[PDB]
Amino acid sequence: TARLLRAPVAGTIKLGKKARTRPYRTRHGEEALLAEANFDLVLEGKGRKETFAILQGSTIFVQDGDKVAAEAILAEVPV
């Protein structure tokens, strides 16, 4: 019922100014974040900047400034 968003490349996470998040314990008991507004998540790769539309109600598994590897889970987006 939800799509998983993964990092296409290694890079650093920028949540941005429009981002509104807050603590969230997922259905599997993991400590994460809940998007309480629509915002763009940014992944700064070496060769390109990737940007992802995040919907209100999405789970966010990363924090601003995190360094992530390619294929790391970034978010779970309800459909």
Numbering used by the authors: 352 to 430
The study reports:
Second, cyanobacterial RNAP contains by far the largest sequence insertion 3 (SI3) “insertion” in its β′2 subunit (630 residues in Synechocystis sp. PCC 6803; shortened as Syn6803 herein) out of all bacterial RNAPs. The 630 residues are inserted between the two helices of the Trigger Loop (TL), the key mobile element in the catalytic center of RNAP that is essential for the catalysis of phosphodiester-bond formation, NTP discrimination, pausing, and cleavage of backtracked RNA. Notably, the SI3-head module forms a SI3-σ arch that seals the main cleft of RNAP and stabilizes the transcription initiation complex.
Since the low resolution of the RNAP-SI3 domain does not permit ab initio model building, we determined a 1.6 Å crystal structure of the SI3-tail domain (residues 352 to 433; corresponding to Syn6803 residues 343 to 424) of Synechococcus elongatus PCC 7942 (Syn7942) RNAP that shares 45% protein sequence identity with the SI3-tail domain of Syn6803 RNAP. The SI3-tail is a barrel-sandwich hybrid domain composed entirely of β strands. The “RTRHG” loop (named after the five conserved resides of the loop) protrudes out from the main “body” of the SI3-tail and contacts the stem of the rim helix hairpin. The conserved residues R367, R369, H370, and G371 of the RTRHG loop make an H-bond network with four principal residues (R79, E89, K93, and N96) of the rim helix. The SI3-rim interface is conserved in all aligned cyanobacterial RNAP and chloroplast PEPs in various plants, but it is not conserved in E. coli and other bacterial species, suggesting a lineage-specific interaction. Disruption of this interaction by deletion of the RTHRG loop led to increased ubiquitous pausing during elongation and an inability for RNAP to reach the end of the template.
